[PDB]
Every structure is written in structure tokens, then in C-alpha cells.
Amino acid sequence: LRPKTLDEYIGQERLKQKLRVYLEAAKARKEPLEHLLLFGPPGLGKTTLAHVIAHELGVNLRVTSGPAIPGDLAAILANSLEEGDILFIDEIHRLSRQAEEHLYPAMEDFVMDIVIAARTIRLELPRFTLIGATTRPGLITAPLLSRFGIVEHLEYYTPEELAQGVMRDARLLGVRITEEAALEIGRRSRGTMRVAKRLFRRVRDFAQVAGEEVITRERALEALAALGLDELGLEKRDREILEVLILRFGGGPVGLATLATALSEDPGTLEEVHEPYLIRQGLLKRTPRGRVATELAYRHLGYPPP
Amino acid sequence: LRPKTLDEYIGQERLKQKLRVYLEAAKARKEPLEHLLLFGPPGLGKTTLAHVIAHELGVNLRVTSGPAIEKPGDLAAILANSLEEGDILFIDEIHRLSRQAEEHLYPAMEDFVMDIVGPAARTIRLELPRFTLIGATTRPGLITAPLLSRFGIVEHLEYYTPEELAQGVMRDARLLGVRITEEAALEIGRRSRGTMRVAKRLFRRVRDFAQVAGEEVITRERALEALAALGLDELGLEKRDREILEVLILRFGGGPVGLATLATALSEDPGTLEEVHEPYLIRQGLLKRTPRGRVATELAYRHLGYPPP
Ligand SMILES: Nc1ncnc2c1ncn2[C@@H]1O[C@H](COP(=O)(O)OP(=O)(O)O)[C@@H](O)[C@H]1O
Ligand SMILES: Nc1ncnc2c1ncn2[C@@H]1O[C@H](COP(=O)(O)OP(=O)(O)O)[C@@H](O)[C@H]1O
């Protein structure tokens, strides 16, 4: 289901060694671990890493959310926590300005004011560990980032790690995916575990409809082609974006007002859930005057070069 | 208009001696006078006495009302913003103070510190300058023991003799521009129920009647006939009181009647009736509060000209 020991955690090298060193040192000196901050793209397994750390330290977990916190933070900190446990907060950059200022005394000297004529009681808190997860250090204020003892980064997964995660999922579900098929599914994923799991579930549905018990590489490739994925993992939406840019604008510089309107999209999700992968794959460039196709989308889309 | 010196105050003997002694002693030792509480029936000149005391002390006033300083934040605002050292804070109807408002009055009166009304909000303990608080209420039973214990001086306002009401009427006529005679003013005061407000109201009504009749000097006969036109008897009874006695005697034979049949027989309520009607009747020996009801005391039969039982 979900890994518990740090050895069961899939991938994430150059971080498990450092995390293990810190955890064993904290256990040896018999003190709670310092507050930890986890960066990286969403859905790489930050909550799972928090659970693994909590299970390795032999303490409880109090997972909560950023936009779910006023005195409710104090209510969570007061009774729901023992000494040395974790208070993993997801999307810590979305904390309210009022609620953020209450965290600094909590993390600094472990005393904070509780609500209630009078509303100022400096209730002392037990020593605890706070883990925060946010997608980018630029979204967090300097005073909050300064109060975290350990800051780490989660990198993307190699296709083999995603393949073995797909293997674990299939073993748990009761499927007999093959090595080549799972590796192809992982390769067509965008280095994200959630995307790999979603793709595996869709391939499982397609194979079940087709009437098969063992999924081979050819069947997985056919199902993924039916989904609408290319060899670079591009969906239909990204291909549509590149096609409309190249056709309607000749590939020339286009600002992030004409491109979104031409696609019936918004300047929101587009350029934050579509363009990052295109730039990472060398498919789109952010010219100061607009955007270009980098001469590679012409080869990918089979169009004559400019 | 309004008297300022304690000598100009009309009547109220056996109280001006003690009040003068206290005022002069406080002036001699150069300290604010202790908190004062005066009882008495309403409209005998309590606010006027407060004004006289304040003027004789040579300080200001902050006259307010009982049911107007609830939510004690405004009480703190009044005590801090609009007061100096030694200023009276006369509160009318002090018994109608809210429990929350009253609880904040005790520290202000005892040690002159109060908690004025956000993480902290109502936490500041403002130091309060020495001041005098004067309270006004009708009956000592309406005030709670903790509040009554905080007052250094407690006195009582008694009713006015007819001569005092008469000279008050003369002063009112002089201020207005009328030439009432001494006998007419004495009759008006005699038909008043020992209170100054009623005497002034009667004088204004008699002035209107005389003006309508087309006169310039009001004589005793004119005042008597105008008061008869008003509906006042020799004992000062209004039409309502005579109606009460008449309905009791006729419809109930003068026998004991509770304060549920009597109010309903008069379309009144058990409220103002027995509060603004029966006090005078009992005081004049016209009605008695029997345990089983009420009786006419054998004098209402003579007053109303009915055969005795
Ligand atoms: N490295 C991993 N090994 C095993 N399971 C994982 C891993 N990473 C994520 N998961 C699975 O994904 C879930 C975490 O949700 P996810 O969206 O991937 O994290 P995030 O919300 O941080 O992106 C867990 O339930 C877990 O089963
Ligand atoms: N002893 C007095 N001498 C002169 N004027 C008085 C006296 N008593 C009351 N008054 C007049 O009555 C007014 C006070 O109102 P009143 O109803 O008599 O007091 P309370 O509301 O305490 O019964 C003042 O304006 C004042 O002119």
C-alpha cells in the first residue's frame, strides 16, 4: 500500500542518505528532529516521505493543510501532538498572514497564545517537529524559510523507478504487467509518480476491456497510443497548443494573452501545467517578445521547417 | 430659573443643615466630598439639589441616566473623557444599572481605577482622578447592598409644606410674567400632593385658564374655580382617584378586593395603579391594604357623599 521503512521508498537518491544520517543522529542524541522543508514539483511523494520519516522515528503524524488554518492551529498543536512527533503541513506557502505569525513562536521557543474577556494565555507546547511541503522556494517568505533547520529538494524519477512503482501497484491490484510494458509506461510518464499510477490504471482498464490477463509491451503501447500519448509523453492538449501556435501564428513570438485566448484557455493553468514540460523537453521557448517552437516541434509534428 | 446657592433652594429643611456642614468641612480640608445618595419620591428637586451642590463646590457636572450607561465601555468614556478632579457624576435612577455596568462601578468608587474596554481589548487599568458620585433613586429597597455600602453619605428628601410650594409658585409666576396672589398660590400648593413638579403643572394649567378667561391678576376665587374646572377636590384628588373609589364602593360594596379585579374593573393594570394612584390614597387615609383585599377606610364614604356601611 504505502511504504513505511525508508528502504521501501522508491527512488529519491542523494536524499535518502542525508535523511537517514539526520534521522539516525537525532535518534542517537535522543532529541526531536529539527523542522524540515520539502520542495519539488507536486505529487512526487512528499506526504509519503513524511509518513516514512514519522514511522522511522516511531512517533505519530498530524497531517493537515495550508488553507485549513486563527486558534485552530493552536487547537491542533495543543492536544493532538505528543513530544517529538510531526505536524506535516501541506502547501505551507498558502498560510494566512494572521496564522503565519503564530507559527514563529511555536517553532522558536515552543510557546504560543491560545484563544481565551481575555484571549492571551501563553500556553507552552511540547517539543515537536514541523514538516512543510511547497512547490517552490519563491512562494515562501524569508522569515518562514529562515526558521527551518533542514531544507531538501525532491527531484524527478528515472523511468526505472516509475516502472518498479508500477510493478508494486500491479502486484497490489492483481495484475501481471510485464517489465517492458511497465518500463514503457514509466517512460511515457513525466517523471511523476502520480502520473505513472494514473497511466497504469488507464492501461489496466484498456487491457481489461480488450480481454487480456497478461499485459505485454505491444498491448501497453497500443493502449497508450489509444490514450493519445506520443514517444515524448505529450498528451493531445500539448500537441494542440503547438499545432495552433505553428499554424495560426507561424511559430513567431506570441504573448501570453493571444495564445491563451486562441486556445480558449486562461493565463492560469496554461504556462504552469502545460508549458513547463514543453520547455523542459526543448519544445517551446520564452522569447522576450513572445514564444517560439524551437524548431523541434516542426520535426515532432511533421511540419516543414521555417 | 434654577437656584445655584443652597440658600435659594426652596424648603427641604433638616437636610440643608447636614449638607451645608459636609460641604463646608470638605472645602476646609480641600478634598472631594464623599459619594452621596439621596432617596425620596420622584420630582422633589433631586437634580436641582445636585446642581446646587455642584455649584456650591465650584466644580462641573456630568449628569447622566441609569439606563443609559449599560455596556460599561461608555461608562468608562464618561468617567475618563468628561471628568476632572472633584467633578460630580450625578446618575439618575441608579437602581436601574445593569449588572455588568454596576460591577464596573465598584472599583471606580473604591480605589479610583477601572478596566476600560484585538488580542487584549478590555485590559487597560486606567488610573482615575478623584471624583464625587451622586445617585438618585426612589426607594432604598431598589438598590443592592453592595452598592448602598459604597456611599459615604445617605440622606432623604421629604415632602414640601404648602407654603414652600406656594413660594415656588410665586417664583415661577415672577419668572413667567404673571401676578398670582399669595392666597391663590397657597391654594394651588395645598391642592398639590407635596411635590414641586405637580405644583408647577397646576400653576401652568391655572395660568392657561386665567388667560382664556381674560384676566391679568389671579385672585383666590379665580384660582379655586379654575382648579375646580380641572377636577381637583379639597384634598387634591384628581378625577381618576375619585373614579377608583366610586367604582370600588359601588361595584364591590367597599369590601376586600385584590389587585386583579380592581385593575380589570378600571381597564387599568396592576402596574401604575397601586404605584401612582394608591400611595396618595393610603397616605390620606382613603384606602387600606387589607390582607384579603382593599377597603375604603370609612372616609371615602364621607368624601364621596355616600351612606356609611
Ligand atoms: N516513492 C513512492 N513510493 C511508493 N508510493 C508512492 C511514492 N510516491 C508517491 N507514492 C504514492 O502516491 C501517494 C502520494 O500522493 P502524491 O500526489 O504522489 O504526493 P504529492 O501530493 O506530494 O504529489 C501515496 O499514497 C503513495 O501511495
Ligand atoms: N426646591 C426647588 N426650588 C426651585 N426649583 C425646583 C425645586 N425643586 C424642583 N425644582 C424645579 O424642578 C426641576 C427639577 O425637576 P423635578 O422633576 O422637580 O426633579 P425630579 O426629576 O428629581 O423629581 C428644575 O428645573 C427646577 O426648576
PDB file of C-alpha atoms and ligand atoms in Angstrom, chain B residues 1-3 8-12 41-49 90 92 136 157 160 168 171-172 195-197 200, ligand 2:
ATOM      1  CA  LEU B   1     -34.669  79.753  36.566  1.00  0.00           C
ATOM      2  CA  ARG B   2     -32.634  77.237  38.570  1.00  0.00           C
ATOM      3  CA  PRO B   3     -31.232  78.039  42.033  1.00  0.00           C
ATOM      4  CA  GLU B   8     -32.029  79.805  47.193  1.00  0.00           C
ATOM      5  CA  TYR B   9     -33.208  76.185  47.427  1.00  0.00           C
ATOM      6  CA  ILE B  10     -36.864  76.153  48.462  1.00  0.00           C
ATOM      7  CA  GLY B  11     -37.700  74.199  51.590  1.00  0.00           C
ATOM      8  CA  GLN B  12     -36.013  70.873  52.336  1.00  0.00           C
ATOM      9  CA  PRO B  41     -40.354  60.382  45.831  1.00  0.00           C
ATOM     10  CA  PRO B  42     -39.670  61.390  42.230  1.00  0.00           C
ATOM     11  CA  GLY B  43     -39.569  65.018  41.172  1.00  0.00           C
ATOM     12  CA  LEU B  44     -38.900  66.699  44.516  1.00  0.00           C
ATOM     13  CA  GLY B  45     -35.815  68.520  43.226  1.00  0.00           C
ATOM     14  CA  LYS B  46     -33.104  65.868  43.276  1.00  0.00           C
ATOM     15  CA  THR B  47     -31.395  67.074  40.093  1.00  0.00           C
ATOM     16  CA  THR B  48     -31.732  70.665  41.300  1.00  0.00           C
ATOM     17  CA  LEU B  49     -30.112  69.696  44.604  1.00  0.00           C
ATOM     18  CA  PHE B  90     -24.916  62.609  39.170  1.00  0.00           C
ATOM     19  CA  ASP B  92     -30.448  59.467  37.855  1.00  0.00           C
ATOM     20  CA  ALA B 136     -30.789  59.187  42.733  1.00  0.00           C
ATOM     21  CA  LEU B 157     -35.844  64.116  50.632  1.00  0.00           C
ATOM     22  CA  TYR B 160     -42.863  70.068  50.921  1.00  0.00           C
ATOM     23  CA  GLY B 168     -42.112  78.244  44.473  1.00  0.00           C
ATOM     24  CA  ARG B 171     -41.155  82.455  41.884  1.00  0.00           C
ATOM     25  CA  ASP B 172     -42.410  80.674  38.760  1.00  0.00           C
ATOM     26  CA  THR B 195     -44.336  67.726  45.209  1.00  0.00           C
ATOM     27  CA  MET B 196     -42.892  70.626  43.237  1.00  0.00           C
ATOM     28  CA  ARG B 197     -43.489  69.201  39.749  1.00  0.00           C
ATOM     29  CA  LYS B 200     -45.693  73.802  38.728  1.00  0.00           C
TER      30      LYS B 200
HETATM   31  N1  LIG C   2     -36.680  73.183  45.653  1.00  0.00           N
HETATM   32  C1  LIG C   2     -36.766  73.697  44.404  1.00  0.00           C
HETATM   33  N2  LIG C   2     -36.566  75.009  44.167  1.00  0.00           N
HETATM   34  C2  LIG C   2     -36.649  75.521  42.927  1.00  0.00           C
HETATM   35  N3  LIG C   2     -36.932  74.793  41.832  1.00  0.00           N
HETATM   36  C3  LIG C   2     -37.158  73.464  41.926  1.00  0.00           C
HETATM   37  C4  LIG C   2     -37.082  72.832  43.250  1.00  0.00           C
HETATM   38  N4  LIG C   2     -37.339  71.527  43.073  1.00  0.00           N
HETATM   39  C5  LIG C   2     -37.561  71.338  41.750  1.00  0.00           C
HETATM   40  N5  LIG C   2     -37.449  72.488  41.064  1.00  0.00           N
HETATM   41  C6  LIG C   2     -37.637  72.622  39.598  1.00  0.00           C
HETATM   42  O1  LIG C   2     -37.929  71.327  39.069  1.00  0.00           O
HETATM   43  C7  LIG C   2     -36.958  70.909  38.105  1.00  0.00           C
HETATM   44  C8  LIG C   2     -36.362  69.567  38.533  1.00  0.00           C
HETATM   45  O2  LIG C   2     -37.240  68.533  38.096  1.00  0.00           O
HETATM   46  P1  LIG C   2     -38.033  67.603  39.140  1.00  0.00           P
HETATM   47  O3  LIG C   2     -38.916  66.656  38.366  1.00  0.00           O
HETATM   48  O4  LIG C   2     -38.651  68.505  40.176  1.00  0.00           O
HETATM   49  O5  LIG C   2     -36.907  66.719  39.875  1.00  0.00           O
HETATM   50  P2  LIG C   2     -37.020  65.111  39.892  1.00  0.00           P
HETATM   51  O6  LIG C   2     -36.913  64.718  38.439  1.00  0.00           O
HETATM   52  O7  LIG C   2     -35.852  64.664  40.733  1.00  0.00           O
HETATM   53  O8  LIG C   2     -38.370  64.846  40.522  1.00  0.00           O
HETATM   54  C9  LIG C   2     -35.919  72.012  38.000  1.00  0.00           C
HETATM   55  O9  LIG C   2     -35.925  72.552  36.676  1.00  0.00           O
HETATM   56  C10 LIG C   2     -36.341  73.092  38.970  1.00  0.00           C
HETATM   57  O10 LIG C   2     -36.567  74.309  38.258  1.00  0.00           O
END
